[PDB]
């Protein structure tokens, strides 16, 4: 294959003097202008101001200043605010809305020295497992331009898979981080709910950012980059992982869901991952009396999701959800969260697919209820695949999406590693150890 | 009296056994709670058996930061086998089957729970009185109220019954009782400590906007340790070594309420003593949010949260979409405080405008009044001093400052930025040192 520097390797090269911040920034610009043609992932570009910031980083390096991401070029999802840059969420009506202040996540990454070259592609309203909008066009999977690289962080995942930038950052309310990392075969971490501030992830022309279920998290090509970006961006420093190796680790292996289906190639890939951990001293269960009702989980999650996305509004003549019923729904969520608390008293991590299949062909139908999917040559519902993603989003747990391999058509298959709440560093560390075990 | 850490060190050092320390606290309660009526739920039989179990762990060389330390907790927290009523008669015989999260954490650190402390009905008053247990009287003056919601907790601390407590706070429930009784109480950062087990009786409804739980003690060191034990994730420790260079915003006025003379000069005395220790003090700032708009937005959200979104028949309830917009108003107010704490390390202000008032019979706050320097001031408007930390989510420390003309304690409120709960404790400890020249 062809390789690039990771985020940490880039900072190491700049700090060591083998290259400068302006050289790494110019190399990233050239990679974008050379590879983004048939991919169309970096849809907002800030190259002139980025060269100035890289020159400012070289001036800091010269003054013996060292920061974890000093001079490291990166992009961020288009929904995040960067002062002077547009934030449209794909809407043609908000194409010329220019942010006047940097988002919290951008401010934290900048304070650590990161240089932002631009922003990556998204679907309209962030409501799709593709990345296509009338402002910028469509993002194509780098492994197969006929397939979707989407999930709403797809521009971000495509840029990482194409080697344009070593680090990115997305949001996730229905798989928006795990799914693009899965389709494009990169690393994505859905973080614990309320662990990272959503400030600056505003809907265009408002200051409305906070929303239940939704989180933001880092996306990269190595797990160590995820751990660094998480420490830079989290509200407070989260507990570091003490998991030294895989022996004794307790795994719950799920290759089936009561409300959706999975590829036989995906099922075997997840089984191959758990088997590599048994060979490293881990214990793997395939069922537990403490697994919450996943069927009831996705139903409660779906109805809370639709309420949050509609902001409590109902169609014409339809009666809306009352505020009292909303408080009861949040109680239903906390009840499910406690159910996962009992489960994680018996297990350290859940291994399961990110989605039932790999990247699907480009769709022009916005309505998910008017789509379908091809699984092992059979047709299946499209929206039903949300069940694979519901557990971490509804329960609030962190969930890692790490590369496993590829199916028969060369489309990447990823693993979903769900750990208990606030154990985001465990998920990263487990993913790091799983990759090494697969190397053996 | 021995504090929480001192009690753990004394038991570990052979000054007493966990059972002896348990018996000694039971004696202090039965000797002092007569005119106080603070520890209203008692679990002495199981506490002694838990104390004997702690002694076996001590002899087994196990060491935990609160091993064998006897304490109580606010009655609204669930303890397995004890009632949780929130002062309601209907819920007097609601027995919890499992410990609350805070109780479970404190027990895992070795704490021994003797019982629970008194509360008002529904945790909805600045007094502690209910038909199930009676009234709690301020240990400094039996005719004055002991504090609100967490009143039995603060009374037990001021009377030397137990060294550590824990309460909740949605409208000053931790700061006000600590103020009325002259003890330490920490209103923590919102969502920093799990409310699990602080359920409404016979439900699993504990989560609620604005409301937080926090420790209550007699020393700031006990607050920090109790915070580290109970927080969801360990919070950043404080790097503040002294008061030199600290940026303090001194507030003694509010556009919608008022504080009496002794309170105003007590807050200024704390500010001036930090100024003598190297801190810089300001009395105004352009980055100070509109406190009039804040207390209006806060009390609107407070009533909606307490009403669970219900409105009486005839009235139309707040729609869910309007509730979402209200939460955007709070987040907008939180960013406004973010910019304020870029210029200041802490706000110094009263906990309440006056000291502990006489026991009031009137349940309607609108029919109550307060004696402020002989004048008559509206009762409910005093929520203003409480609204900033609750609506903005910041941590707020309530620490002893002194007393007024009648010997009633006056406390200082120390507000720091969100997730700097240890900074608030640390600053409060340095203030206490500065006031002992
Ligand atoms: N029902 C449904 C809605 C949206 C998505 N897109 C997604 O993956 O998350 C979007 C992240 C938005 C953060 O506010 C998928 C399914
Ligand atoms: N994260 C998020 C996603 C979609 C919406 N939906 C919407 O259109 O509300 C815009 C706010 C209008 C305030 O007047 C809101 C937030
Ligand atoms: N309007 C108003 C309501 C309640 C209080 N009592 C208080 O201080 O907090 C109570 C803690 C409840 C935790 O759920 C004061 C004023």
Author numbering:
A (entry chain A): 15 to 454
B (entry chain B): 18 to 454
Excerpt from the paper describing this PDB structure:
Here, the ligand‐free crystal structure of UMG‐SP2, a metagenome‐derived urethanase with depolymerization activities, at 2.59 Å resolution, as well as its (co‐)structures bound to a suicide hydrolase inhibitor and a short‐chain carbamate substrate at 2.16 and 2.40 Å resolutions, respectively, is reported. SP2 shares the domain architecture of amidases, with an α/β‐fold containing 12 prominent α‐helices, 12 β‐strands, and five larger loops. Structural analysis and molecular dynamics simulations reveal that the flexible loop L3 consisting of residues 219–226 is crucial for regulating the hydrolytic activity of UMG‐SP2.
In addition, a SP2 variant with the catalytic triad serine mutated to alanine (S190A) was created and used to solve the complex structure (SP2S190A, 2.40 Å resolution) with the model substrate 4‐hydroxybutyl (4‐(4‐aminobenzyl)phenyl) carbamate (BBC) containing a urethane bond. The aliphatic 4‐hydroxybutyl moiety of BBC crosses the oxyanion hole and enters a secondary cavity separate from the active site. Only one region near the active site of the substrate‐bound SP2S190A, belonging to the loop L3 (residues 219–226, corresponding to the loop L3 also found in UMG‐SP1), has a different conformation than the other structures and the computational model SP2AF2. Upon binding of BBC, K224, and concomitantly the flanking residues A223 and A225 perform a backbone flip that leads to a release of the active site steric blockage and the K224 side chain now points into the solvent as seen in the SP2S190A structure complexed with BBC (right insert).
